[PDB]
Amino acid sequence: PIFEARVKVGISSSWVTSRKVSWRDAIAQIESDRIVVKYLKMGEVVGEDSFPFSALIDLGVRIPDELKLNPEKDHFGIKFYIPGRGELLVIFTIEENLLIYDEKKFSEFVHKVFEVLINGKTVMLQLARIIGGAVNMESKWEEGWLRVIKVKSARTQKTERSIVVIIKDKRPVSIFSDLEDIEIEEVDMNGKRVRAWKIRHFHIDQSVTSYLYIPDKQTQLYVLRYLLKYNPAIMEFIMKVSDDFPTLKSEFQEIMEKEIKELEALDEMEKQILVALYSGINPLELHQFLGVSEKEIEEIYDRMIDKGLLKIVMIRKIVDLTNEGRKIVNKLLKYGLVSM
Amino acid sequence: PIFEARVKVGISSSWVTSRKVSWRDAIAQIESDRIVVKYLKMGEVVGEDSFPFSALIDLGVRIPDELKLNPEKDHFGIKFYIPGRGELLVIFTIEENLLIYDEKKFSEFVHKVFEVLINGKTVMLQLARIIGGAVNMESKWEEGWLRVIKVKSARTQKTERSIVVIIKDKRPVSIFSDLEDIEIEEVDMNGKRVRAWKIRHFHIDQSVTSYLYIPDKQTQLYVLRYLLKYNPAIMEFIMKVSDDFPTLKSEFQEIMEKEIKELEALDEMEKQILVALYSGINPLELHQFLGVSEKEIEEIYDRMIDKGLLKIVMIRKIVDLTNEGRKIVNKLLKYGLVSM
């Protein structure tokens, strides 16, 4: 097999009155066309389930806390519709004991699932169709395939996991690195009306606009899921092109509402600190604007920082003369060494 | 003997032109009229100088650092003029080898010399001749004698070594407790006009000027040395009596000049920080007035404090948003929960 992992597996049946999922001991194997789950009693195998990629509806889905086992560890849910049973949520998660479970090995296992789903899937690409607001007449549609790789440049030169477009006779195009993204319809230069993606991405030396169409609707969802998971900064751009995907409009709506409630619940004083420091008020003077003492503000600065919200750039210290410090100054005056 | 000390003794002569002092080893005896030094080699008495308390010019003289044997140990210098030979400076110190000398019987040895020289000497007192600037003519001349004791009462109520005037059938007068001092000399003293001391002192309730005439001018020098030695705070108000005591005015000149040089040696920067803080400039803003960076001012603060001149009153920390702080503040106005 491509990859294995010893793991806890829970299967939901994902229906109303979702009963508590039952977790079993198994080792999970990635094949070319399926995930096979081999269940364990002691060290032995009692049975197995095969889950075809033919039936993979969605992956990387949002796991309710009611369905989490061991909320410290990470959970990964893959949703299939197998025709006989129905729509299933298969969730994989590792357990604490270090002699059975390995987090990095599990972390690779989930990544290989994306790699198998995405690598080699077909895509048509028209590279750099505007330059400086003028449409490139040398820009032709190219056929190619997706490849999940680490793209090491940005315009920032920060290495980031992404998906590139492999094209015949030219090295891959880093179509998801440095973005803006809208979605448009297009007359294919060969002739089809296509439901394609318009990407304003920072290309080789200049901001550019290229058109990208992924025929398989499923692999589009796969691509979006992975770009979210391993690069959460992008959550903005793709949410603009996220409407075609009901499972995402839902989850984005759900997280938005939780974020609202979380921000409501935050301490009003601490929210005030963040906005004032963000706007540019001197931290040494901030207590003066918010109507609070030096002692109390520094204590609140201590409660932040613990929360990871603030960082110390520098410690200033309020100092005063000792009796020996005064002895010097009074000597200087007595001998006519200072004016006052 | 009244008291003895085995010490390391060094003698300097105005007759010997070379500045050298050789530290012989001896026992030295306090007598009624003299101090006798039986010199000691291999624990055996090879020589003996007898130093009368008559022709004891001065004691507690300031010792040049050129003449100090062991700069840790105390050096007590007693100066005699022996007419056949000249002016002698006998310097007393110890090596405080823990079984041949000891520190604490040394520090008392010097004090007992003052006690022997001062106790019982005739003195004459006109107590509280001025109250509020008004002449008290119930204040008469009383004759008595001096005594070396610790006088508790001051305005700080803190005990201090001092000298009192004993009068028959009256408690002692603590004439050197809380003081200012001029020399008037015109007072008649129930007879011939004679040079006396005008002493402003707090006494019981009120700023009071009393007159004190110590007939023996050598005894006068001894009480002044004693007060200077064991209450060096008393130095001020004395120097108006630095006239008529030349060796005292010389030592005052040399101290102040050595102080002004020391002050000029201090860092120019640190002195201005000391004066500015003494004036009342905010320590957080002081770097601004001196045209210095915050990093350097806090560095200089740390070099001070160590030297004992400054003390931290409060710790203020300049604080900045983290990446997580920005996420929250970005989300707040992203959802319009904060107005900027």
Residue numbers in the entry:
A (entry chain A), B (entry chain B): 2 to 341
Task: Give excerpts from the publication.
In archaea, the adaptor protein CheF resides at the cytoplasmic face of the archaeal C-ring formed by the proteins ArlCDE and interacts with phosphorylated CheY. In archaea, CheY-P binds to CheF, an adaptor protein uniquely present in archaeal species, however the precise mechanism of this interaction is unclear to date. Binding of CheY-P to CheF induces a rotational switch of the archaellum. CheF forms a twisted homodimer offering two CheY-P binding sites within an elongated C-terminal tail domain.
However, we could successfully use the dataset deposited by Paithankar and coworkers, to solve the structure of the P. horikoshii at 2.75 Å by molecular replacement (MR) using our initial MjCheF model and obtained a complete model of CheF. CheF consists of two N-terminal domains and a long C-terminal tail that reaches out from the center of the two domains and extends into a long tail domain of over ~80 Å in length. The first N-terminal domain is formed by seven β-strands (i.e., β1-β7) and an α-helix and connecting it to the second domain. This second N-terminal domain consists of eight β-strands (i.e., β8-β15) and is connected to a small helical bundle (i.e., α2-α4) central to the two N-terminal domains. Helix α4 spans into an elongated C-terminal domain (CTD) that is formed by α5-α7, a long β-strand (i.e., β16) and the C-terminal helix α8. The asymmetric unit contained two CheF molecules, which interacted through their C-termini employing a buried surface area of 2700 A2. The strongest determinant of this interface is a substantial β-sheet, jointly being formed by the β16 strands of each of the CheF monomers. Moreover, both monomers of the CheF homodimer do not align symmetrically to each other but instead tilt their N-terminal domains by 90°. The residues involved in bending are E265 to L267 within helix α8 (obtained from DynDom47). This observation suggests that the CheF homodimer exhibits an intrinsic flexibility with respect to its N-terminal domains, which might be of functional relevance. Thus, our crystal structure suggests a CheF homodimer, which was confirmed in solution by mass photometry (MP).
